[PDB]
Structures are given as C-alpha cells and as structure tokens.
Amino acid sequence: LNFGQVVADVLCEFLEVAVHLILYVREVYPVGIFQKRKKYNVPVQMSCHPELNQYIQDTLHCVKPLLEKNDVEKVVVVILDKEHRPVEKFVFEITQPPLLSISSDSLLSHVEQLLAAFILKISVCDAVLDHNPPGCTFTVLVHTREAATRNMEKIQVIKDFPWILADEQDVHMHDPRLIPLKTMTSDILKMQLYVEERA
C-alpha cells in the first residue's frame, strides 16, 4: 500500500477542482460552460465542456506519476494574454515531507479541510487582482526537482498528449506582484499557493 500514491491522488483531484475554479474566477472561458458544485464541502465551479475537461485530466494524468515520486516542486497554471505573454501565474508549490505520517484520526477529512481553505482563497482572489485582458488563454507548467530522471519520458503517459520543454517566453515575468493565497502543512503534504502578477 503506497501512501505516496494516495498523496498523488488527493493532489490530482484537488488540482483539477483548482484549475477549473481558476479558469472561472479569471474568466478564461465563458461563464456558461461552468456549473456551480460543492467539493471539499465548499462551493466550486466545474466546467461542463467535454474537451476542456478532457484536456485538464490528460494534463493531470501525466503529472500524477511524478507526484507519486515526489519529483514535482511546483505546478503552475499560467495565464497568457492575446500575445502569448504571461499575465498571471498560479503557483502550487508542493513537497511531501521526508517521511509521510498517516494518522487514523481521519487522514482524509483533515487534508480535505486544509485543501478547502485553498479553494476559498481562490474564489476571493478576483477581489485584489486586475481584470485580465480579453483573449487570454492558459497552460500548465511543471517544475521537477533536481534529482529527477528523464522526466520527458516518465511524464508522457497519454498517447497523443506530448509534453515539451517550455521556452523563456512561456514563463518570463520580470518583477511581478506577489499575492499569497494559503499555505498548509500536514503530515502528508506541505503546499503553498501564491499568485504572481505582471507589473
């Protein structure tokens, strides 16, 4: 029984709710494709668009074995303008502790209450961010840890869904404004979520 995979599974489920919500509150897509729902006992917005939904799953399906190996240091939802320049980064900094501790108190009730706080902060972040320009799009950047091997082999999990190395323009953001959202430390997961925004 591999608890590093349990942790990968909680993170991928949560990262899916979180991408969907980010796309909502940053209005990356039209509002009508979203349905209000509850996850982590808290309101969220999930897209009902089939291929957007398939694209987010394929992305996260590819990330998940790196998560199970603790080989991922950040997962970044980056939002691009009509000119392919980053306007916002949503940085999920993730580290499993050196040894996972698994309580029988209620391991998953608790991590879910801690994840719920990340969702709530995402909801109210449009109260402090500048409205995005029209025609913005998104992508997902994965930063791996230094002792990680042939990531571009381990990460290509899905048949016709290649991964590449990003360019400097994909990620360039000279002197951004930093917006912390939430931080958690659990026996299984240390996670930071903050937003970098273009000056």
């Binding site: 897509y29 039209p30 509002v31 009508g32 494709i33 349905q35 897209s47 009902c48 668009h49 089939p50 291929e51 957007l52 694209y55 987010i56 394929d58 992305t59 590819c62 950040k74 970044v76 799009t137 998104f138 992508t139 997902v140 950047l141 994965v142 930063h143 791996t144 990531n151 571009m152 990460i155 016709d160 869904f161 290649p162 991964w163 590449i164 190395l165 990003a166 360019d167 400097e168 994909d170 990620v171």
Partner: peptide, 25 residues
C-alpha cells in the same frame, strides 16, 4: 525551465458555451 504540454487547451466559441449552458447544465 519547466515542462508544459505540447497541446494547447481548446478554444471555446460562445455558441459552444451556450450549448454547454443549454444542454450539459
């Protein structure tokens, strides 16, 4: 320098969004 998907996320026309709103709740 990080990795990203080579495939871009879909473009969604507002008619397609009206269809989603209308038929897939």
């Amino acid at each position: 320098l990080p990795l990203r998907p080579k495939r871009s996320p879909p473009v969604i026309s507002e008619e397609a969004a009206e269809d989603v709103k209308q038929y897939l709740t």
